[PDB]
Symmetry: D2
Subunit: 202 residues, 4 copies
């Protein structure tokens, strides 16, 4: 039931999207911050220091490069987004980044999860201590994946017609309500006019 | 389910008799082929008088099995040497397979044929595949062997694979167990290790 | 004085080009055959068998994909060209392919050499047993590289205004005359109308 | 005369080493901190906040894995070390990490530089906007490389018989005295008994 960090990607009747939600046991003093073309996961005021005791807690979790949205549970968000910007198809951007960066070297060998979507295709990947897998997101249905328990894409009837909605949904909505220790959430949505960002706190 | 033609098939794992990797060609338009054991490897080559086939299709001849030290590599194409070499030059199994599938990619033919592969040694085993919809490399479950093919069965599938010798294993993936049902069997090869070392073997239809 | 296989890439007053030329001691029974969008290095009639005794002799030495031309001394030619086709900048297409394929496992640990060019940039790389290097081709001057001896880019006042010209030059022209054991050659040229292929025999 | 971040690697009469030195114009409020099996570049007390305005200033510069020492100017220090730890040869570890992570997306397209050394070989590599290069370190002589100006290996008569010496030298000694804006320095030395770490401030 505690899935750790969760991300979602796909298309529904209202447009394309990516959603991210932090779930933590020992580092709840965090929030999401919208900056130019990106959403970062940072410590809340007075906890800046946390970053220096654990290197996997702060990072951009959503990057927007052109017509492409990138979402991941770590710094690989920039590694992948940079490859997209510099010209590289989605699948390889994810694969090359997950292969090189690998699972996180902590207590639980925490997988690095990620996904990216543009006007044509979307891909979702994950790298664990037991494997690496990058796959196409089925057009007929959005999907989500997490660091713990749900280590492989799972379909989700994800309704949302705005980044606000998406971000709230992965936080407290639908089936995500049953996953524990929700901290902060974020998302990007594109109804065809471009990517818009939004956050959502508990 | 309607299709029983899986194309090229490979299997890997450990049973009560030891470790192994098996491979079997299945073709519709290039049956003029067989497996030839050479030093530390098994190649898939045209049969005499068909040497020419290789120049009309670059995906029909390749080492399908490579042995490097305590490690056995198996695949449906030239990546067999790309992976084997990385293992030889020092690279863990998962990465070796993954870096090689990522670079080489699915085969650029009529059916965007996936590149499949697997490798095993004294400690772990990893199986992987690269298609036009993805790339996947995963640890082979210790409690059960598994197999994968270019068509239909594009993700690992468990198999009660019995055999206690390369001869046995190569025969099994060719005509035994559930592999019987997969059509157009051409040639087969395999590598087995009972703890003494890797031994190769071929099997014709 | 025997550089093995040699390739050249760059631009001159007449257009963009890539050139290739095989140089062999023990496998001269070879020629270059133009096919759709590519030039392959194959055994001469009655030698089809050679390929089974050495896996590094037959291969497409030039691939044209869109506005981009790819040239190498091996099968990586297709690895790199596919990544360009599927969308991947030139530097990475060459780098990823060279890193993964590595030097050829023969008597001389023969390096894998490659280059790619389009209307904007051009890159040349090589992978040996002592390293890996991929670099931008200097706009103000073509350059060449070979499997042996000249294992790093070298400038070349390369004149030619057609594939025919280019293929003949790298084979018997300029400084390439002094490099021994010339077997067959090939080249692609682009004067602004598209890529055109041409072979040249001794 | 400002080479940015500089690293050195090689063997001398006293043993094997890797040295690192930060040089900065706009972020001198930094020091090096030894922690388990590694040395990190971090903000000085009261500047924790800098980490959030620039994602390229805090990182482990040195990582020790077994008989191998890794040094770099970025997070790729862990990317490379982890691959080495998980079983990967030095050349590929550096090449796969530099290919995936790329030059740093800042004002100067700052290259990612790196090097690794164990009881047998040593390799140094760099990734820029113009290329990628990874090469074996010449056994008969140590070499150093930087982000700016000296973007290619360069020989250095690097004398030192202890991490303290090594660290001091890349900071204020020899030819490094002439490189400007020294902030902090660090190094790992191995005289055959194992890898020892040390830092040095201005």
């Amino acid at each position: 039931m505690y899935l750790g960090r969760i991300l979602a990607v796909g298309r529904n009747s209202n447009g394309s999207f990516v959603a991210y939600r932090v779930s933590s046991r020992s580092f709840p003093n965090r929030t999401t911050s919208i900056q130019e073309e990106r959403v970062a996961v940072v410590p809340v005021e007075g906890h800046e220091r946390d970053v220096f005791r654990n290197p996997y807690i702060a990072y951009n979790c959503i990057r927007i490069v052109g017509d492409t949205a990138v979402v991941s549970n770590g710094s690989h968000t920039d590694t992948i987004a940079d490859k997209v910007a510099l010209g590289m198809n989605l699948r390889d951007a994810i694969g090359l980044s997950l292969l090189a960066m690998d699972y996180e070297k902590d207590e639980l060998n925490t997988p690095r999860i990620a996904a990216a979507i543009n006007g044509s295709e979307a891909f979702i990947g994950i790298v664990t201590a037991d494997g690496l897998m990058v796959s196409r997101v089925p057009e007929e249905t959005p999907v989500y994946i997490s660091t713990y328990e749900q280590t492989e894409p799972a379909a989700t009837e994800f309704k949302a017609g705005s980044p606000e909605e998406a971000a709230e949904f992965i936080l407290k909505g639908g089936e995500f309500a049953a996953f524990t220790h929700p901290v902060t959430a974020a998302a990007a949505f594109n109804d065809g006019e471009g990517w818009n960002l939004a956050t959502r706190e508990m």
